[PDB]
Amino acid sequence: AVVVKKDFRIDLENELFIRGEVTLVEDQIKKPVLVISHGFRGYKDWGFWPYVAAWFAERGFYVVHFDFSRVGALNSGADEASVQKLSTVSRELSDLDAILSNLREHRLPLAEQAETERISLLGHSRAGGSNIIFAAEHSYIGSVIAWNGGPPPKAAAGNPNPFINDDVEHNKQRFDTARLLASLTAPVLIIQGGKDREALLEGQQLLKEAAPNQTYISIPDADHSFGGEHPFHHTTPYLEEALEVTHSFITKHYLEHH
Numbered sequence: 001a002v003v004v005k006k007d008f009r010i011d012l013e014n015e016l017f018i019r020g021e022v023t024l025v026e027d028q029i030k031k032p033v034l035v036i037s038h039g040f041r042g043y044k045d046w047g048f049w050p051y052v053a054a055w056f057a058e059r060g061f062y063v064v065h066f067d068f069s070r071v072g073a074l075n076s077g078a079d080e081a082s083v084q085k086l087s088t089v090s091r092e093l094s095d096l097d098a099i100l101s102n103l104r105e106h107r108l109p110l111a112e113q114a115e116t117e118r119i120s121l122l123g124h125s126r127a128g129g130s131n132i133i134f135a136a137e138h139s140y141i142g143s144v145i146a147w148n149g150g151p152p153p154k155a156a157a158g159n160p161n162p163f164i165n166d167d168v169e170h171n172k173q174r175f176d177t178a179r180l181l182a183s184l185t186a187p188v189l190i191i192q193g194g195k196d197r198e199a200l201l202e203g204q205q206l207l208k209e210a211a212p213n214q215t216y217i218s219i220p221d222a223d224h225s226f227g228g229e230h231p232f233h234h235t236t237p238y239l240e241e242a243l244e245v246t247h248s249f250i251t252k253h254y255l256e257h258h
């Protein structure tokens with residue numbers, strides 16, 4: 001049982017691109033799909049992501065994780081205005097659309113082993129919110145999990161990004177995850193570490209109050225990265241628990257029960 005890792009690159013407009021990887025144990029059968037989105041400071045090789053992708057591949061998934069367009073732009077020497085424009089939630093939604101379209105058109109590596117009837121999303125931090133938005137707007141997403149994220153987007157930390165300020169202001173209803181969670185009939189899981197930063201914990205309580213239909217799990221002693229921040233020598237009890245709970249939540253919802 002070898003975990004294969006197949007690199008790919010999706011060419012977008014002009015000089016932009018998405019680099020990604022498919023992680024899979026090749027069993028000559030279609031496997032449910034997990035698409036992973038990294039957080040605002042992440043990239044596909046950051047911290048626990050390679051371990052996480054392999055962990056789900058060992059447990060029966062066809063896994064996709066990838067660099068958002070803004071990562072390749074930065075690495076390619078794009079200037080600050082270009083990188084800032086690519087850093088909106090709106091661009092995340094568009095990059096996810098390119099990943100999912102290429103998956104659904106069987107252009108990703110080993111796509112004959114992807115069960116595209118059974119797509120789940122896993123998003124970390126800021127991508128937890130954008131994954132909820134994407135899932136709510138796309139019927140073909142069957143379930144979504146957010147790790148230490150979920151609340152509606154707002155202006156990023158550090159330097160002012162005006163494109164982010166405009167994106168947030170022109171999309172207040174569209175990006176309101178409390179309203180989206182309340183009406184989404186697909187199962188949503190939010191895992192939140194109890195040691196995380198305290199404006200985030202308050203945002204998470206508003207989601208649970210707004211949308212008690214969904215599933216909210218606390219890991220009381222875990223921080224924003226479940227201890228798996230870069231570099232990654234080994235897993236942690238908080239990351240293993242988040243993986244277990246995420247896995248259990250997905251399989252619990254594969255069969256339609258009533």
Ligand SMILES: O=[N+]([O-])c1ccccc1
Nearest residue numbers: 190192204208216217218
């Ligand atoms: O209250 N909670 O346990 C909770 C609330 C939001 C997200 C995760 C857990």
